[PDB]
Ligand binder design. Structure first.
Ligand code: GDP
Ligand code: GDP
Ligand code: GDP
Ligand code: GDP
Ligand code: CO
Ligand code: CO
Ligand code: CO
Ligand code: CO
Ligand code: CO
Ligand code: CO
Ligand code: CO
Ligand code: CO
Lengths: 161, 167, 160, 159
């Protein structure tokens, strides 16, 4: 009952760190990892993919999206540009992912005082895009597990409908 | 949650002192801010809910930054300050108002503050301040960072107006 | 990394301003590095300073390649170095990048033999459309401010 | 059985002396030593590796880490540079050592009045790296045994 989940977004927002915090629970300043969780009383294996710093030289590959049922769009709350770029990522993902894939918006680095994107702004963009929103901190381990459990539950719902 | 507030005005009117009095409850006649960290944080209760204020304050010879569009990005509150003992800083408020209106977002709430009300050498009356505020269409408050007079009121008044409009 | 250049007539104190900023010392290859903390980040400043006989080099187009900050310096005790600022401004604008942020510095403010007033410097800066700061590498007055002010303007620009 | 432990850090911080103080209980101003310890009513043989000065001329040989279950990162509290370099050592160890290896940060030469790195700073870095912290003095025999016993227990614990 594997669930393929992708982390997408501008380089530098903290994608690889969120994944490391979730699987290993660590932070420090074969492109996937596995972690098994329980969903509605059933063991679910999450196959979590990390871009491998390749979003800097070319668009996401086809086989990358193949089988992906969850796609997490991440931006940096301290970097306006990465937030503005979310619309482009959303477009790219929609023009290539399965029609039933569930998306989720994550505003990362909520621990930083240098924040320039407010929670209200993130919530507003998520609403406009029609997807759930979560603010996290891979550094302080804030809401990281929630990202994956929230997304996994939404995916389990689509599968059963 | 977070409210970005800027303190603007002629150098020497008491902007940094007002911020220090509000956040650290201190006042140094010879205080000197640190070149590097431009803002401080303080969480206050507005309508029974926690609001984090991100208060920005620039140094004198870093004044060029206060005329750029980038500096006002995201600010929802802008406090214009003058020295009641220095006519020139009061006269300059109109220029600051212009700069703020042209480089900042039209949704930001402004507030006029006449500081150093503790000084007997005052030359700008409260009526004059009130009159300018009215002309500009913004709230007015006289304060004294030195004697801790009406400093908290500056920020709570502004925060409530910003919230009152967020709705 | 942020490439910053110090330009101006020989003898105004360019090297002494750089030494004071990095080594905080004052003594009466062409660049030094110093990491500063702005907007909660470690920005590395690559500060360039050239000798007198290397002046011929400071007027070339390659010297300004990549520079995002350019500090124009004059001696407040030497009218000629102040008058020459307009020529330096012209050379910089014609040989440097349009996005580069300039800043005018009047150095040696500690000297009683000053002949250029702060008001004059402020007026020229206004005319040129750039920030102005008076400093003293000798007494460590406003030296850090020169670089932090410039670094912030360069950053605001990058993010703008 | 046997527990392989390595001491890593800038040259001159006192790695070799900490090992001598622990095994021979001596101080003076093969590349490994053996010492059998008792942990929770159980005897454990510690194979403690000394760098042999390698750090002064080369990257620690990939096989030097092989089999290591304990790695002690050491700095000199009187030398800021050796403390700053700990982050690089941590990176090198994490990229070449075994995943299960337990790390520990040691601030040595605590006997010196010329200290420039505070205990708080050391504790803060240890926390940031996610590893235990101990300040020692091979010279005054302060907390040297604690280094090895603490690490041995964490390794056993991880077993
Ligand atoms: N303050 C802060 N920094 C973070 C967080 N997550 C990642 N970072 C930092 O952001 C940079 C990029 O993170 P990384 O995970 O490699 O980004 P990726 O390109 O999206 O994979 C690194 O310098 C991280 O230490 C966070 O939650 N808070
Ligand atoms: N008497 C008096 N002096 C004040 C008050 N506030 C600031 N000052 C003094 O005015 C000078 C400049 O204040 P400062 O906060 O640095 O001004 P800024 O340039 O606007 O940041 C300092 O000498 C302060 O002690 C006040 O409420 N009363
Ligand atoms: N009084 C005084 N002398 C200074 C200052 N800065 C540099 N000088 C002196 O001016 C001369 C030239 O300085 P230097 O940095 O080599 O000038 P450059 O040609 O612009 O590099 C030396 O004698 C310095 O000691 C200053 O801030 N005050
Ligand atoms: N004061 C003092 N000196 C120490 C201590 N430990 C080692 N030293 C001295 O530091 C120098 C280097 O020690 P050594 O063990 O060879 O360092 P290594 O390069 O890390 O192996 C020698 O001069 C030692 O005597 C200590 O705890 N206190
Ligand atoms: Co990455
Ligand atoms: Co101030
Ligand atoms: Co008070
Ligand atoms: Co020179
Ligand atoms: Co200094
Ligand atoms: Co030419
Ligand atoms: Co040694
Ligand atoms: Co002993």
């Amino acid at each position: 009952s594997i669930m393929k989940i992708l982390l997408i977004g501008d380089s530098g927002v903290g994608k690889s760190c969120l994944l490391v915090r979730f699987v290993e629970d660590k932070f420090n300043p074969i492109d996937f990892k596995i972690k098994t969780v329980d969903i509605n009383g059933k063991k679910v294996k999450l196959q979590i993919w990390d871009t491998a710093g390749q979003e800097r030289f070319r668009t996401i590959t086809t086989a990358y999206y193949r089988g992906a049922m969850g796609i997490i769009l991440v931006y940096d709350i301290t970097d306006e540009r990465t937030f503005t770029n979310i619309k482009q990522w959303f477009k790219t993902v929609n023009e290539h992912a399965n029609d039933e894939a569930q998306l989720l918006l994550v505003g990362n680095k909520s621990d930083m005082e240098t924040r320039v994107v407010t929670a209200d702004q993130g919530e507003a963009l998520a609403k406009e895009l029609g997807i759930p929103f979560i603010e996290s901190s891979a550094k302080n381990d804030d809401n990281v597990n929630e990202i994956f459990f929230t997304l996994a539950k939404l995916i389990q719902e689509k599968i059963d409908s």
